[PDB]
UniProtKB/Swiss-Prot annotation, chain A:
Protein name: Small ribosomal subunit protein uS5
Note in the entry: Altered uS5 proteins have been identified in a number of mutants. Some mutations in uS5 have been shown to increase translational error frequencies. Some mutants in this protein can partially suppress an alanyl-tRNA synthetase mutant.
CC annotations in GO: cytoplasm; cytosol; cytosolic small ribosomal subunit
GO biological process, one term: translation
Outcome (variant: residue 19 to L): In strain: SPCR9; spectinomycin resistant. Not a ram mutation
Source species: Escherichia coli (strain K12)
Modification N-acetylalanine occurs at: 1
Residue ranges of every copy of the S5 DRBM domain listed in the record: 10-73
High-level lineage: Bacteria, Pseudomonadati, Pseudomonadota, Gammaproteobacteria, Enterobacterales
A molecular-function term among this protein's GO annotations: rRNA binding
Keyword Ribosomal protein in record: yes
UniProt keyword Ribonucleoprotein, yes or no: yes
From Swiss-Prot, chain C:
Family, as annotated: Belongs to the bacterial ribosomal protein bS21 family.
Keyword vocabulary terms for this entry: Ribonucleoprotein, Ribosomal protein, RNA-binding, rRNA-binding
Keyword field contains rRNA-binding: yes
Reported function: Probbly involved in recognition of ribosome rescue factor SmrB in stalled/collided disomes; fusion of protein fragments to its N-terminus decreases ribosome rescue in the presence of SmrB.
Gene name of the encoded protein: rpsU
Name of this chain's protein: Small ribosomal subunit protein bS21
GO process annotations (BP): cytoplasmic translation; ribosomal small subunit assembly
Swiss-Prot record, chain D:
Organism (species): Escherichia coli (strain K12)
Designated name of the protein: Small ribosomal subunit protein bS6
NCBIfam families: S6
Described function: Binds together with bS18 to 16S ribosomal RNA.
Region feature Disordered, mapped onto this chain: 98-135
Disulfide-bonded cysteines: none
Swiss-Prot record, chain E:
Organism from which the protein derives: Escherichia coli (strain K12)
PANTHER family documented for this protein: 40S RIBOSOMAL PROTEIN S14/30S RIBOSOMAL PROTEIN S11 (PTHR11759)
GO molecular function, one term: structural constituent of ribosome
Residues modified to N-methylalanine: 1
Function according to Swiss-Prot or TrEMBL: Located on the platform of the 30S subunit, it bridges several disparate RNA helices of the 16S rRNA. Forms part of the Shine-Dalgarno cleft in the 70S ribosome.
Biological processes per GO annotation: cytoplasmic translation; translation
Keyword Ribosomal protein on entry: yes
Subunit structure: Part of the 30S ribosomal subunit. Interacts with proteins uS7 and bS18. Cross-links to IF-3. In stalled ribosomes contacts ribosome rescue factor SmrB.
Top-level taxon of origin: Bacteria
Encoding gene, per UniProt annotation: rpsK
Protein name: Small ribosomal subunit protein uS11
RNA sequence: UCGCCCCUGAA
RNA sequence: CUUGAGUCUCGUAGAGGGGGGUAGAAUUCCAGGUGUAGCGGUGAAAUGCGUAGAGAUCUGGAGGAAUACCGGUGGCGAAGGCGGCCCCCUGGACGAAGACUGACGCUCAGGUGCGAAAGCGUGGGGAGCAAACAGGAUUAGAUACCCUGGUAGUCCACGCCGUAAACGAUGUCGACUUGGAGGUUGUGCCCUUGAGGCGUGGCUUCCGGAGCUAACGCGUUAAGUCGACCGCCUGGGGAGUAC
């Protein structure tokens, strides 16, 4: 994709951070992996999974890859414009728009991912097994998938032209 | 010309004939194994429909002692 | 392993190993073992699994045939 | 009623009895609202294997339409005749009087390219008349 | 090899022909030459040759037995075979070939072999 | 079994006319006729499971049609019953 | 083809 | 009213169901013949069987059970399930022109019927195989796998029990949504001048797109996309046990 870490407006942030393992021929190795997001407070948000032998380069590489998995989002107000109740992976995702005068209200991944993405008055919820790692798939289920007033308005405008043409 | 309404063949070197199969010593003996066994269809190359038709005829004639079925004690 | 058809010519070794293929196929080797209906029928469906896959193999093979690596 | 097609195996040395035997059967069939399409034969062909011993056996065929009532009595005879060896009967499918492999064997005999015997051809013609005489 | 010799007291049962019975068993090999009148002339087997185990069915074991049998029919004067190969084990051309190479020739290849239509039920046998 | 002859008789009797070609009346009629003598086809046998299943379906079907008939014309339904032997 | 079991724990 | 459903007509194919006949092969028993010191089994062995003549081999007779090949993701049935051949009685499916009925339909707790195999009762039958059982072997032990025998049973008739990884681990019905190749079975068309060339239905495998799924994969015969109704689940062990 394209950069989401941009001078004078960058909004670096992290999500997960942990270690994972592979069982090698000898002993067992540890790969320092982590999820990140850089925002701008205006959308443009992504995610990356680094692999490293150290925690700093785990976040380095994950923010490289964050820019390579940027998704665009555009909105008005401090809240998302459309509810998306879609589910990606086995973590169940829900997402309402909500009037200003309320917080993010979420302790999971979607506390921080729903901050960087220019939203902070959104109300969201999740069901199913607790697992922050795929709460992050609310990139798919709300930011990537959306509707906007001028999208729906051009449905109503497309139809009129066809009747005239015949 | 047009509207003559049938084919001139139903014979092939691996696909059988149609519309009549019946008991009679002569005809049947060509389509069975020499040991009084019946042919496999995966060798001969016959399709199901040919095989079913032949089978019926074979077995009837066989148990009228026209085709052998004693070859392990003959 | 033989059939009732005779060989009447001088031989010391004669063809009788494709009279084996006109008799035996494991049909004298099923007389010391019991099986269920399930067992041999599933095996028949591995010899028609061979035949459908035969077509599929040819597409894969064609790419290899282009290049020389043998 | 429907077609029927009694093929049976007589004793090969009681083959001279055959015309008379047939006549007894055929007459009853006709009288029961049947019909004799044609009587056919297949002579004393050499058997593939012994059925009730023997080195050869007589064969004979019948093409008849008859109600089941008579087909009963006919079967009874055979299954209590020791001269009659095996027996079989086929039915329906129009009639196999003409244009079948059984007929093909018969056609060769009349032309004198005989499948089995000169005598066997003559018996078929006799039965169709129903003026049969023993061989 | 180690096979015994055999001989018979009759020389009056000949017809100059005899059935070569062979039973090529997975655990043994029998070779018996019966006359063409259907009455025994000679017989021999692998275990009587002296073989033991599953080396009674082997090619070698079949040959030795075919030749033991040959000694038991030579005195009648027989020189034609009506080979009846049967059983599933080896020794099925071992015997044939040995006979040919022993002053006999083949004349007929016939099949007399048990083929069941399942009028009896098989045993389980080995499972170790 | 029902012969094509026996069919045509039932068609001529039942229905509004003759040569109805399958009308509610004739439909029930045909079924009835079969069932009655297939009682004797299970009086010559014990269990004959597939054929038995067949019989049951015909009984069911006969009743279904009758149910519509009382909701179409009472007079018609009553009349048909009298002429038939099955009505349970 | 030659049967053949048994094995306290955190790096 | 006819698009749903159903009937009528004409054909089509099949191991659909039930009943009764019939053929041969194989094993076995019994009888006779031939021939003699082994047979059989096994990784080796041993028990067992043989001079009172076996094994094998040949001839005659008898009986029980099952039908080699056929035979294939081939076919049929609601499912369970169903294989030599023939007759009788009988069910279901599908297609083709038309013709008719006119929502008569769909599903379903209860209820009712059908149930592989084992089992049980009653009566027939008994070859082979085989729980049990008895020797032998392997093993430290071997109440087993292994070997030699072998009883109940398996088999037939009738009734009963109703279970199964009763499986596609996939409720049933209706409706839709890319396709490709094969299999199978109807039917229309095409110098049918090609066993076939082009269609169009029914059923059946394999592949795979989108989509779905946690993934494996499923994938127009869905685990896709919808509706209708019913059944079930709601942590594991305790327990499909107790009461």
């Amino acid at each position: 994709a394209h950069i989401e870490k941009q001078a004078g407006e960058l909004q670096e942030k992290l999500i997960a951070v942990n270690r994972v393992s592979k069982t090698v021929k000898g002993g067992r190795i540890f790969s320092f992996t982590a999820l990140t997001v850089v925002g701008d407070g205006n959308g443009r948000v992504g995610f990356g999974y680094g692999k490293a032998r150290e925690v700093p380069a785990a976040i380095q590489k994950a923010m490289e890859k964050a820019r390579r998995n940027m998704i665009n989002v555009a909105l008005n107000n401090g809240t998302l414009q459309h509810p998306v109740k879609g589910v990606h992976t086995g973590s169940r995702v829900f997402m309402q728009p909500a009037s200003e005068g309320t917080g993010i209200i979420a302790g999971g991944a979607m506390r921080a991912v729903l901050e960087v993405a220019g939203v902070h008055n959104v109300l969201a919820k999740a069901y199913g097994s607790t697992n922050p790692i795929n709460v992050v798939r609310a990139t798919i289920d709300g930011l990537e998938n959306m509707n906007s007033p001028e999208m729906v308005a051009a449905k109503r405008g497309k139809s009129v032209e066809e009747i005239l043409g015949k | 010309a047009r509207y003559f309404r049938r084919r001139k063949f139903c014979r092939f070197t691996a696909e059988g004939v149609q519309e009549i199969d019946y008991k009679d010593i002569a005809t049947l003996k060509n389509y069975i194994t020499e040991s009084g066994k019946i042919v496999p269809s995966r060798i001969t190359g016959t399709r199901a429909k040919y095989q079913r038709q032949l089978a019926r005829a074979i077995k009837r004639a066989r148990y009228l002692s026209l085709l052998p079925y004693t070859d392990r004690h003959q | 392993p033989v059939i009732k058809v005779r060989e009447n010519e001088p031989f010391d070794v004669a063809l009788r190993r494709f009279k084996r293929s006109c008799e035996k196929a494991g049909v004298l080797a099923e007389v010391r073992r019991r099986e269920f209906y399930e067992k041999p029928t599933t095996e028949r469906k591995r010899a028609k699994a061979s035949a459908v896959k035969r077509h599929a193999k040819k597409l894969a093979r064609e790419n290899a045939r282009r290049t020389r690596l043998y | 009623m429907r077609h029927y097609e009694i093929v049976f195996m007589v004793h090969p040395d009681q083959s001279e009895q055959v015309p008379g035997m047939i006549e007894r059967y055929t007459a009853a069939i006709t009288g029961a609202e049947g019909k004799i399409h044609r009587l056919e034969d297949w002579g004393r062909r050499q058997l593939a294997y012994p059925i009730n011993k023997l080195h050869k056996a007589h064969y004979v065929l019948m093409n008849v339409e008859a109600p089941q009532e008579v087909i009963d009595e006919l079967e009874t005879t055979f299954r209590f005749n020791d001269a009659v060896i095996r027996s079989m009967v086929m039915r329906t499918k129009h009639a196999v009087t003409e244009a079948s492999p059984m007929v093909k064997a018969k056609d060769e005999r009349r032309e004198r390219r005989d499948d089995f015997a000169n005598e066997t051809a003559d018996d078929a013609e006799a039965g169709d008349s129903e003026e049969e005489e023993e061989e | 090899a180690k096979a015994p010799i055999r001989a018979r007291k009759r020389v009056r049962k000949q017809v100059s022909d005899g059935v070569a019975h062979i039973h090529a068993s997975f655990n043994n090999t029998i070779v018996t030459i019966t006359d063409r009148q259907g009455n025994a002339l000679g017989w021999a087997t692998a275990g009587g040759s002296g073989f033991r185990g599953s080396r009674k069915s082997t090619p070698f074991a079949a040959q030795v037995a075919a030749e033991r049998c040959a000694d038991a029919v030579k005195e009648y004067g027989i020189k034609n075979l009506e080979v009846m190969v049967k059983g599933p084990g080896p020794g099925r051309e071992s015997t044939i070939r040995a006979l040919n190479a022993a002053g006999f020739r083949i004349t007929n290849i016939t099949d007399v072999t048990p083929i069941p239509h399942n009028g009896c039920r098989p045993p389980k046998k080995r499972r170790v | 079994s029902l012969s094509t002859e026996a069919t045509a008789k039932i068609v001529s009797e039942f229905g509004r006319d003759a040569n109805d070609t399958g009308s509610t009346e004739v439909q029930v009629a045909l079924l009835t006729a079969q069932i009655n003598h297939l009682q004797g086809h299970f009086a010559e046998h014990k269990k004959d499971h597939h054929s038995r299943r067949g019989l049951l379906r015909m009984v069911s079907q006969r009743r279904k049609l009758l149910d519509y008939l009382k909701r179409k014309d009472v007079a018609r339904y009553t009349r048909l019953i009298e002429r038939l032997g099955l009505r349970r």
